[PDB]
Design a protein around this ligand. Structure first.
Ligand SMILES: O=c1cc(-c2ccc(O)c(O)c2)oc2cc(O)cc(O)c12
Length: 437
């Protein structure tokens, strides 16, 4: 088999599609991953395993055949141009593979190049979709595009939303890209999402980065409208740690916010005071673009605290020292917290991070809510942060959320085990690819 994995620019898009690539390669498939060269060569220069040629995994390999971007530096501006070059170029690359005994059986794309199922359609090549957010978020988008349930509008900005097989969200707990008020540099992601929901008809399979028991009933309901397959999580399918060793177990407050979120300086300074004040141990990831910490922060907290510029998150998350996780609640981060058994402290910023935060707190039951997101735009005072740090590590539910945590970590490892739901959804989808052939 030979499947073509096409992904939009961005760390958050490429990583999961790569992980879907290392997985299909593990199953005797040859995968060719591609992404715009402008950001592609940036992966080249910044990654150790570049591409001299295929890179075997199990009995399959992963080739690299980047799309010529035709874009040297000169968001909506680039999206339209990229769509232009992609349709220009992608048949030319598929046509090359046609004459070298490599007819492509399937294409895989993510929502932020939603036009890809159109080239798949014209060229006769079946189209599938890698969805990188939860299944509650997919349902948010699908119901909204087809307008099957009512959302906030300009005339009612605080309307609740009642999605089937979901807890009733609130106006600011629906994925922020469906809100009718959106920054004009971001409207282009709203349009990409919505365009992908228009192209769903042409698509025979949606591969979702979640597993069957995390969103059990939801996946059953939407599976009648939609061809949804849970195959996750993908990260588990396929000096920092020396320091945490010295600490006692379940003791270190962990603090990341992914590699895009940039908090506000006032929010930084309320957290540093919070940590100082309750005097907890911590590992706070402070990625550079320059945030300042209070005068004598480092000396005051001592060896109880530690600030770093980057962290092996998956590793760190698998540590017993960790007491909790202050997170921006991206999908992969919510799932890495779930699968590893760690309680969370939710600081949603934008997008679907406000839905996942509603889920971590009130559904999966694995922690405490610190903020409600950009639409709240309320600098959270250190007093409250200190309260949630107490609530999640010492307080009356602290062990019940620990319990709930260690049970979603059980179910995650069963989903990915040999004859588990997530793994047999993979092999089946691979089994479907042959039956076309
Ligand atoms: O809605 C999205 C919003 C943003 C974003 C939001 C606020 C910012 O101040 C910023 O610099 C980026 O970044 C994204 C980045 C993504 O990969 C996907 C998204 O939906 C978004």
């Amino acid at each position: 088999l030979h499947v073509f994995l096409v992904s939009a620019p961005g760390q958050g898009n490429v990583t999961p599609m790569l992980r879907l690539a290392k997985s299909l390669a593990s199953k005797g498939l040859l995968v060719t991953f591609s992404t715009p060269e402008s950001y592609g060569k940036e992966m080249r220069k910044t990654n150790d395993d570049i591409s001299d040629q295929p890179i075997l995994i199990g009995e399959g390999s992963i080739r690299f055949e980047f799309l010529d971007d035709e874009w040297d530096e000169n968001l909506d501006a680039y999206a339209t141009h990229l769509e232009r070059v992609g349709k220009q170029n992608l048949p030319r690359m598929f046509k090359k593979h046609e004459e070298e005994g490599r007819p492509i059986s399937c294409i895989i794309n993510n929502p932020f190049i939603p036009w890809v199922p159109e080239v798949a359609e014209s060229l006769g090549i079946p189209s599938a979709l890698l969805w990188v957010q939860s299944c509650a978020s997919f349902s948010s988008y699908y119901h909204f595009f087809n307008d099957l349930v009512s959302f906030p509008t300009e005339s009612n900005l605080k309307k609740d939303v009642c999605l089937p097989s979901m807890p009733m969200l609130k106006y600011d707990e629906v994925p922020l890209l469906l809100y009718p008020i959106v920054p004009l540099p971001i409207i282009s992601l709203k349009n990409a999402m919505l365009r992908q929901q228009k192209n769903l008809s042409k698509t025979f399979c949606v591969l979702v980065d979640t597993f069957q028991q995390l969103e059990d009933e939801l996946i059953h309901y939407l599976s009648k409208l939609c061809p949804i397959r849970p195959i996750g999580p993908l990260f588990k399918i396929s000096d920092c740690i020396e320091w945490l060793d010295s600490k006692s177990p379940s003791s270190v407050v962990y603090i990341s916010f992914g590699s895009i979120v940039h908090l506000k300086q006032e929010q930084i300074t309320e957290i540093a005071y919070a940590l100082m004040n309750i005097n907890i141990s911590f590992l706070w990831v402070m990625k550079p673009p320059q945030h300042v910490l209070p005068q004598g922060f480092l000396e005051k907290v001592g060896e109880k605290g530690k600030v770093v510029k980057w962290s092996p998150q998956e590793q760190v998350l698998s540590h017993q020292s960790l007491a909790c996780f202050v997170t921006h609640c991206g999908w992969n981060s919510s799932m890495e917290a779930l699968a590893n058994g760690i309680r969370v402290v939710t600081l949603p910023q934008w997008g679907d991070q406000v839905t996942n935060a509603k889920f971590l707190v009130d559904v999966f039951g694995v922690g405490v809510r610190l903020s409600r997101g950009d639409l709240e735009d309320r600098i959270i005072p250190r007093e409250e942060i200190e309260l949630r740090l107490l609530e999640v590590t010492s307080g009356e539910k602290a062990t019940e959320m620990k319990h709930n945590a260690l049970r979603w970590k059980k179910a995650a490892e069963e989903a990915v085990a040999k004859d588990g739901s997530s793994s047999k959804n993979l092999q089946e989808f691979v089994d479907e690819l042959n039956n076309f052939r």
